Design a protein around this ligand. Structure first.
Ligand code: ACP
Length: 308
């Protein structure tokens, strides 16, 4: 215990940034930040991929921390779709983004500015997206996008609750994205430009990352599993879709699946984040989805202003 202190620290830190007492560094191309206020997952990766698709007319580089990765330095994970490292070296989320975005570069660094300077030197990108950037104040962003989910609104600061910062810090966002609307719909009004995000669960991937039809999940009970910030929303999605799940295994976030052995005759259903670690396993599939945003044309205008 407790708790009261973390908040002091975070508050102190934010005030220092608020008043020009800590350095904020600036990259010489536009930078969009995507981030959120809590631990446990908010659809940031998905929103990043959506953004990357909006931005397809530009050379895009994603700057990521690469959580849990086995490497140290600033690292180029992918150049314009050429994967330079294994998923274990990249961290599962940078690798997943690189893999699903064959037109985008991905760099992992603790210090995002440093990652960006390395990318500029080697990759020449026209825009950076920070994949988890909201708390990383020391890097200037031209558009600060905050993702919020319903749960956040009644949550509290770590380590009692899941908030990384108090809710008042919503003030720092240029735009809010209200996520997980297909599972926990909600409304937030703040006066800030606000966009609801929906995941449209439409697709099945085999372990070679090829689309396959659902006919396979028919009259089969599956064993489902994931290791996620929150496995609960995945198991809720499966129920809402009416997928017949006979057993659900809830693994730790970023689980490496070293212990995993499929049982003969069974069908396994999992997420793409998990499937990157199980490539080529037969009879392991992932549920995939499209990301859809309200008022996209409004969002696009907001996004393109940064280039002017
Ligand atoms: N309900 C679901 N169905 C299918 N895949 C899902 C899923 N929920 C999460 N995923 C997968 O896990 C990835 C992580 O998304 P998630 O919403 O869990 O956290 P995140 O993007 O906010 C990053 P972090 O957990 O590190 O904060 C997604 O891109 C997707 O591959």
């Amino acid at each position: 215990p407790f708790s009261y202190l973390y908040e002091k620290i975070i508050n102190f830190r934010n005030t220092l940034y608020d008043k020009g007492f800590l350095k904020i560094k600036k990259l010489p191309v536009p930078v969009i930040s995507v981030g959120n206020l809590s631990v446990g997952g908010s659809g940031k990766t998905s929103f990043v991929m959506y953004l990357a698709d909006l931005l397809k007319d530009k050379r895009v580089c994603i700057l990521s921390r690469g959580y849990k990765r086995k490497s140290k330095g600033t690292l180029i994970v992918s150049e314009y779709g050429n994967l330079k490292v294994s998923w274990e070296e990249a961290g599962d989320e940078p690798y997943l983004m690189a893999k699903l975005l064959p037109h985008v570069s991905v760099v992992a660094s603790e210090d995002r500015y440093k990652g960006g300077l390395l990318a500029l030197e080697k990759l020449s990108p026209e825009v950076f997206i920070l994949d988890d950037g909201f708390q990383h104040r020391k890097l200037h962003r031209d558009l600060n996008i905050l993702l919020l989910k319903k749960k956040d609104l009644k949550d509290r600061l770590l380590p009692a609750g899941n908030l990384r910062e108090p809710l008042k810090e919503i003030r720092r966002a240029d735009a809010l994205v209200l996520t997980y609307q297909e599972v926990e719909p909600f409304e937030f009004f703040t006066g800030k430009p606000t966009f609801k995000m929906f995941r449209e669960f439409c697709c099945l991937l085999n372990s070679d990352f090829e689309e396959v039809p659902f006919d396979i999940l028919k009259e089969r009970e599956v064993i489902a599993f994931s290791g996620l910030g929150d496995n609960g929303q995945f198991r809720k999605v499966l129920k809402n879709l009416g997928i017949k799940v006979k057993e659900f295994m809830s693994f730790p976030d970023h689980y490496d699946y070293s212990d995993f052995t499929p049982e003969e005759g069974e069908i396994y259903l999992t997420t793409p984040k998990d499937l990157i670690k199980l490539q080529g396993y037969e009879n392991v599939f992932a549920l995939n989805f499209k990301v859809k945003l309200e008022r996209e044309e409004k969002l696009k205008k907001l996004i393109y202003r940064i280039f002017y």
